[PDB]
Design a protein around this ligand. Sequence first.
Ligand SMILES: Nc1ncnc2c1ncn2[C@@H]1O[C@H](COP(=O)(O)OP(=O)(O)O)[C@@H](O)[C@H]1O
Ligand SMILES: Nc1ncnc2c1ncn2[C@@H]1O[C@H](COP(=O)(O)OP(=O)(O)O)[C@@H](O)[C@H]1O
Ligand SMILES: Nc1ncnc2c1ncn2[C@@H]1O[C@H](COP(=O)(O)OP(=O)(O)O)[C@@H](O)[C@H]1O
Ligand SMILES: Nc1ncnc2c1ncn2[C@@H]1O[C@H](COP(=O)(O)OP(=O)(O)O)[C@@H](O)[C@H]1O
Lengths: 93, 436, 445, 437, 443, 61
Amino acid sequence: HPNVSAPPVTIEVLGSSHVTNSINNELFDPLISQALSDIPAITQYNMHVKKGIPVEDFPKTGLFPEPLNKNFSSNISMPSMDRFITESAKLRK
Amino acid sequence: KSLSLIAAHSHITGLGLDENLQPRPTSEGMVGQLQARRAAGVILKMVQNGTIAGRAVLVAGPPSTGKTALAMGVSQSLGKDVPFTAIAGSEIFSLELSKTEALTQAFRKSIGIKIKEETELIEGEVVEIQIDRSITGGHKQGKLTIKTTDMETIYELGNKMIDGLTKEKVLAGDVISIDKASGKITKLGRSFARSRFVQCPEGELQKRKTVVHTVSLHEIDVINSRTQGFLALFTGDTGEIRSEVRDQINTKVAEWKEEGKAEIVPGVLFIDEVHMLDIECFSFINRALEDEFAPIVMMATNRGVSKTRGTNYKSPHGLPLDLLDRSIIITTKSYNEQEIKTILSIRAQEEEVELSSDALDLLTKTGVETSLRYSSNLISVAQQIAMKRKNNTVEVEDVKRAYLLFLDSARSVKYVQENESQYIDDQGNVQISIAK
Amino acid sequence: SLSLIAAHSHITGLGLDENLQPRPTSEGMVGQLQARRAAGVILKMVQNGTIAGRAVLVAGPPSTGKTALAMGVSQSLGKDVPFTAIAGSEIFSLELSKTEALTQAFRKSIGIKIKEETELIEGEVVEIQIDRSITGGHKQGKLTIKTTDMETIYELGNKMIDGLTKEKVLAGDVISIDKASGKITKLGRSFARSRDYDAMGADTRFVQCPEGELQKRKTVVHTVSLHEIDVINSRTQGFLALFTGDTGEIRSEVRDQINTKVAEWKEEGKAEIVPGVLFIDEVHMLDIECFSFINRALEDEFAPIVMMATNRGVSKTRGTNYKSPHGLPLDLLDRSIIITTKSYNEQEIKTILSIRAQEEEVELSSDALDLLTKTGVETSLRYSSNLISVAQQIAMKRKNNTVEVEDVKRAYLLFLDSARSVKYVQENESQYIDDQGNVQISIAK
Amino acid sequence: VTRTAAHTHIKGLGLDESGVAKRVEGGFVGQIEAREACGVIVDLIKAKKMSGRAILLAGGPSTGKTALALAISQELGPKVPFCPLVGSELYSVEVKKTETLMENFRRAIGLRIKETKEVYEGEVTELTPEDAENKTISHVIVGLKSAKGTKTLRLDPTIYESIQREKVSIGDVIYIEANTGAVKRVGRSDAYATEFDLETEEYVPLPKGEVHKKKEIVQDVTLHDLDVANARPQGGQDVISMMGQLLKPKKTEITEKLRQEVNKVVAKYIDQGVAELIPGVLFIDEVNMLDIEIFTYLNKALESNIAPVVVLASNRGMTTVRGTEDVISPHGVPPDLIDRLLIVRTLPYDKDEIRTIIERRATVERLQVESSALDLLATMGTETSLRYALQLLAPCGILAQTSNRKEIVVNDVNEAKLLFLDAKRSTKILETSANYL
Amino acid sequence: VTRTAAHTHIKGLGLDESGVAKRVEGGFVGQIEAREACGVIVDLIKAKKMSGRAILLAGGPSTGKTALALAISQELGPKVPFCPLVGSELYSVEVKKTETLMENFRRAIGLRIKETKEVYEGEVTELTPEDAENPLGGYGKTISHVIVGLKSAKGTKTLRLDPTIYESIQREKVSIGDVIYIEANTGAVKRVGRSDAYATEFDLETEEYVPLPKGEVHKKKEIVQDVTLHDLDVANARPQGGQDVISMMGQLLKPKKTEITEKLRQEVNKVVAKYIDQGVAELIPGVLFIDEVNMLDIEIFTYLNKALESNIAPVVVLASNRGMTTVRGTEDVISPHGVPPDLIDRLLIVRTLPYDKDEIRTIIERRATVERLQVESSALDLLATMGTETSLRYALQLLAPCGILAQTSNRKEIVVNDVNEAKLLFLDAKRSTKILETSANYL
Amino acid sequence: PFSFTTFGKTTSKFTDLIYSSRNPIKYSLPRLIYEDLILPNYNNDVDIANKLKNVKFNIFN
Ligand SMILES: Nc1ncnc2c1ncn2[C@@H]1O[C@H](COP(=O)(O)OP(=O)(O)O)[C@@H](O)[C@H]1O
Ligand SMILES: Nc1ncnc2c1ncn2[C@@H]1O[C@H](COP(=O)(O)OP(=O)(O)O)[C@@H](O)[C@H]1O
Ligand SMILES: Nc1ncnc2c1ncn2[C@@H]1O[C@H](COP(=O)(O)OP(=O)(O)O)[C@@H](O)[C@H]1O
Ligand SMILES: Nc1ncnc2c1ncn2[C@@H]1O[C@H](COP(=O)(O)OP(=O)(O)O)[C@@H](O)[C@H]1O
């Protein structure tokens, strides 16, 4: 896992809401954010059946690449109870 | 302050000069080199005047004579918000940038644009926050009671203030700052509530704050290049910025100076070991010094009548004569016993090394026979030897032990030449066997 | 309209007869009768189109007209025939190897002619009435396309409606639809429906409403080079690499598949191979690897006729350490035929100078033409050709229309040739930077 | 207070209406023959007829080749394109050197396009979108208002899409360009500044002028600008992106097909009278740094129909050409290229015009120099070099100013000569000393 | 049992409390003055005060320079960052060599930070999104908020997530009944796995089953983290960890070294100095070791001259076998140890002497005991004579074939016949060169 | 990993969680550069030149 995880460098411009709007539209662009994610299934049922939106006019989703495992999905590692036994040779024996 | 351990030029706080540009014998961590320091003060006044553009100076001399010390003194006496770009000669041989493009970036990192602007800020200590939620949540209302040491007020918040205060969670007792136009809330910290800790700010909320920005021309070149974001200012993958962007930036900067909305701050581009550039970089420097938006270039070299890189002939200082025609040369000289002793005493005083007078005399004799840098390196290891014996003062025997344990250049050369069979020579021959 | 008067703009082709015999002065080409006859033989072989991969080396001293002969061949070749004129220095690149750059230069010089028939309905849209189907399949539409003269109603299918909703066409938009293939375009908005909106959009283009017949028949002849097909089939969206140039070392199997498909499209008759000429100017500036790849690449049936130009004598081949005639190895000269260009006498210099002065609209006097001819015989053709225009500007600064002897003498005094500059440098060698870098900027000692 | 560069004092070639160079005019003194030759060259450029003409300025160092090149640049004017370049700049690590040379060739051919700029500025009073389905909006009625009155506009759904992109509501001062279609939200008006006591809205004033403002502008582009405009491996130059794209675009070898298509489009626009073609100057200082391959491609590219006027500078003599081994050629330029050049010889100076150069540089930098100090500076310029005196002019002024004098005295010149060394004295110190100076 | 290498037998410098060196301790034999100088350097590093101090280990081949560098690294401990390097490793095809040298300079400087993490951990009980009223506007997303219920041990609370945090949730494929772990510092979500409150014998995806997390939801936990300055530089140069689309697409791009600018390094230094001034992090300077420093060319030495003068540069130790050798990348610059005199003036040369017969004998004995081999005294004496005759490394590397030949003949001891057979089977460099000189068809 | 972040942290019916991570490194840009070189303005020409280079002189028009 990496040692340091960092967001991009935030650019601040004092006294301008246009900079904040453009930065929020760039970092959180809804097309790219929707492409790297998925709509919830009950939400898809609500747009398709309840709201009558065809599936061809849905936003494109599910384009994020799959990881190797569930272990490779995130960099956070939980303290394993089975590891705790083998951390001490006295306790393992 | 920032991150600073004790370095080679930490004791130099600038140029020890008077109001008449006369160098004191010992001032601001610099001793000796009176003509070199006066010439550096003249160059510093050329930078501080700001009316002279594209002057190349060459600091030339023997090694360990203070060329980089002179450049550090100029940089320390320059002050803040004046761009000092110090690079080595090998830094511009890049794999993703051409050498002329890297030289252009180094040239334009040393010219700044000074813009002053006003911002309305609300910096205060939060008394309380109330927010009354709706039945469903379509509309949110709230009151923010804030105070300072002088004032105390209540604000009727809108929806966007409520969303920007719930995000970046502000409780009672927090000193915060709000920019009203950009909608940015910065938590300066917890106030003096006993229950980090920052004092309650002074009164007159919603104050005008004047911010003075110095932005280098390279940053505006990266910004105006629409294929380059400003993250390339940190990642470094600017990747050969086109010339037309630089022409638009030059015309915009000239019209900003004419309109009075901005000022131009010239700076210093220092090139340590300038002999390591090749001849095409020297030609590019020869043409690029003629620009109006060009800084003053200090170059340091120690080579004497050396072969110019990229060519097959030899030139003085490793530099061709068309470059030396465009430059005025500052010559640094060697040090005598007293200047070496004063430099060693200053270096010992900086590193909190208490040493005796005869130890200082022995270190001065070593730095006269061998080199100033060898004795200045020997000071710290002699101090470590001194505290190994639980002694707080460096004696003569500590310097003798440090001289015995760590060798200089001439002793290493002599010990290699006496036992040249044990080392690997130019032909790759070595006798690793010790017998027969 | 954009082209200015260049160094070879006066040449409209080889000045030959129907018997391949060169005229003394025709189509801007003067002299070089053996070279022009040989180049006419070369042109016929390209026009025959039945043999492939001949290497022709145009050799001679500089300023004799090797590149002039190549431009004469290219002008006599006519349009829609691939002529690729490249220099030898363009092969050395950074993301393409030398053999790959040579392959792209070879396959850019041979193409295929393809005939297309278009039934174009071009007009402004008045109304699109959509018959909304209950099941949604086969959505019928009524297109009211309209010219200046007359207007019909067209029936529209479901994929037609999907194409007309993929791009945003409304009433008052000028579109043309192909009947045979169903191609869709949007030329923009008509000028009659242009004043209805106070501000135009980002992609809004204003075009004139077409007149005449609503549906027109047209036959379009497309000349597509083999390199174009390689770049198209190399990538998913390969047409951008045809213009940006980042093709990036197209693999071999694409090229064999495209060659076999070109052969079968030829044998079923929907395309015909048009060979052309690849002209490498200054071919001595190539590596020995490039020469070996040229030697093997000339033996393919999809290979153009290669004309190479060299002004070198017995010079060192690049990439090796030995000298060779023309700067070319002996196995390359083995698979080649050499056209030799000779120097010009006084009459040919005078005729070429008069033609170049007539091309630049400069009225030369007879004594000025004689002085320029004497300078051309003494120094060089190109020096007098460059002197003509600056003498014209000198005479125009003197409020004169034609040039005289004094204008040519002033241009000779102001601008130096090679020999005079060599003499001035050799007389004062301390003032210039030597090969060892030494110079004397100081004027006194 | 304006800064002073090395070529600030030169404003032109200093010629009269007959082309004869006045001796001291336009920041020049002496060098009359090369100035007259450069005047003939700029007359040839102003004729706007020739293509691929090449002139080489050959002379010693500190003689005024670059001075004559910038004098040509001021004589032509800012309308004519001028591309200054070094021979070292063609060696790029992203694209090949012939492509860089051809890009700099296309950078020196410009276009003037007359255009209109029409701007609607002010606060939105009404924003009513009319749908008229055939879900999809037909148009939008937008009412802008400034201090001189209000104005109503009908806008297409593309501008409505751009308006809803900017989060424009009722009461926001916005900016609309009628020709481009760009929508920029300036911010909320102060008439709605007291709806809440604290909110993230930026409250800007109402525009004092009219809502609709129209003016005439001229666009000065180059052929290289139009080349790189439609040759992008990753497109999207239209969208405003402060942050960079995820994949860095690299310089690529632009094919001749794009050049011919751009030329066809430009010729079609010129034939309509919209655009005007301005041939310009590509100046290459230190042309001896060019590789022999770049010289060969220069030989090929000087015969193009759209090539500009190329001005080369060199200070070498009988020198080996770069990239070769035994080609001794004048000025480091191979003899095949030299046959296509016109050579302008640049002469050295003597004491009197060196003195006038020194006094002109002193007058431009606003320094008062005494007459005997000027004579000492001229003698030092004849002894060491001219640029040594020209670069020691400003330390003399600083040493005079630190002694509270506005006049440079002889003692200031002696002090500046003592503090700063020329090349010859430093070479003598280098030769006499042993341990690396 | 244990796998051994060339420097396994060395546990440290092996000095007294006064800095003097015992002759045979710490896995070291001889080199008393070199070990004492290395101990003085180790104390200088432990002072944590100086910057850019540089020494040079000079000596012949097989004299123990890398042994002394490993002893310095072992005596400093695992907390002090030690960066071993070869002079050939700085030549990278992705980025310039000076950037690689600066990256290793920042890699040798360490930082120990206490970090407070705000954590929402627990088992997902309900996960219901609230849909947007206009899903196809193109400006928002299909949902507005997501209500998620989490229960820990003795605690239950519900969270209203914005669509970014829910996107981070659903990219971990979080369903009902999953114990999860949301880190509020970055928005990163860890799916711990299925809760053991339900049946755990009916899954097919080899999942782990975890209990409910102890304590309340929304904890604040303190973690001690050891990073380097290069880690911060490469994290800020290539941003990953945020939930914005730039961080997420930069996760998926191919990693590539870039020329990290001085502006980013100065900003990282400012943030680290702010962390120190709040008393939450401490700076641990370390060692950059460059073995075979002769492989560097003149440009890396020139950049080293500038980089050693920085106020953040680590302690740099170098090794070289060369004598009076020309510097790489130059033509006529003859210099000691292949290091130019501009860098030699900034150095402190530590000499290393060759060994005697008895020192070689006890080095062979210690290498035999660390490899679990039994050698007879006569065979040990023959190994010592072979080491003095051919080379020390040839005598050390012949011990394992001797053990193989001993265990082949069902013996635990190494007899003289075994070392004679290993001498016959395997050749040193001198005998191989003598075969090369007396052969025809280029052996 | 060590989170190089500044975010909304509690100093100490539902409680909402909003993504609020920011880099500690802040780049300050003046309003003049953004409003005169990037944004369209009446005295600027970025929209006109952008339409001229991207639409009017596009070779795929
Ligand atoms: N005049 C001086 N005053 C104070 N310190 C000096 C002086 N000259 C040199 N030094 C110190 O000596 C050390 C080596 O000098 P340096 O600047 O490296 O000279 P050079 O760059 O010419 O080799 C530096 O750490 C510098 O601080
Ligand atoms: N036969 C010819 N007829 C007309 N012009 C010629 C002829 N030969 C040469 N020229 C002129 O001489 C100039 C230089 O000739 P060029 O084609 O460059 O010869 P080379 O390629 O051998 O150097 C050209 O600009 C061309 O106009
Ligand atoms: N004839 C002249 N009159 C006035 N100033 C001159 C003249 N010639 C040269 N200079 C000045 O001398 C300086 C150096 O000359 P420059 O053109 O750089 O030499 P080079 O031709 O070697 O490039 C320039 O700043 C220029 O202003
Ligand atoms: N003083 C010593 N005591 C014990 N073993 C040593 C000693 N010096 C060297 N060695 C051994 O000799 C071998 C060669 O040492 P090394 O430092 O790798 O070579 P070099 O000195 O040429 O860099 C190492 O495996 C090491 O274990």
